[PDB]
Design a binder for this molecule. Structure first.
Ligand SMILES: OCc1nc2ncc(Br)cc2[nH]1
Length: 167
């Protein structure tokens, strides 16, 4: 039993809600919140900009130190950093950005990072400003993630379409 509330169950391990991931993180304080990161951990907009803003820029400060030490992530890769006031940990996951020409096949590799954590609150990777079809992202999520994932979808219209079209 966990504290996530109001999710629709899609499969044995995948759940979904029409919610702002920031507000959902602040309320649940999950062990792991997933950020829709880019390789530079520059949290400017989309989900990353919103998460970082909610940490009063502390996420960005931590991220800049991480990059200065380690260099950029790989597309499809991830790193675990602090969750600040939102969660115990933040799993920064880089899905391919379609508006950068990156191979959508890397979406499965991106979701594989979720399997290193027993429970996660997450957005749909590569959705929104990353330019991929959120319906396809949900399909890859369900077919790749085996751990317990709670998906927050900001847009109600999108949330309703994802549910109604789910196979
Ligand atoms: O909590 C305020 C907020 N702003 C946001 N912008 C984009 C996304 Br996705 C989620 C957001 N949550």
């Amino acid at each position: 039993v966990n504290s996530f509330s109001g999710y629709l169950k899609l499969t044995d391990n995948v759940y979904i809600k029409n919610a702002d991931i920031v507000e959902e993180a602040k309320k649940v304080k999950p062990t792991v919140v997933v950020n829709a990161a880019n390789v530079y951990l520059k949290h400017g907009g989309g989900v990353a900009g919103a998460l970082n803003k909610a940490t009063n820029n502390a996420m960005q400060v931590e991220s800049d130190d991480y990059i200065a030490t380690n260099g950029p992530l790989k597309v499809g890769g991830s790193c675990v950093l602090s969750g600040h006031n939102l969660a115990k940990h933040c799993l920064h996951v880089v899905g391919p950005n379609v508006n950068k020409g990156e191979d959508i096949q890397l979406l499965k590799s991106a979701y594989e990072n979720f399997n290193q954590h027993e429970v996660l609150l997450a957005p749909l990777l590569s959705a929104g400003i990353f330019g991929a079809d959120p319906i396809h992202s949900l399909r890859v999520c369900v077919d790749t993630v085996r751990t317990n994932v709670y998906l927050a979808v900001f847009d109600k219209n999108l949330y309703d379409k994802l549910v109604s079209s789910f196979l």
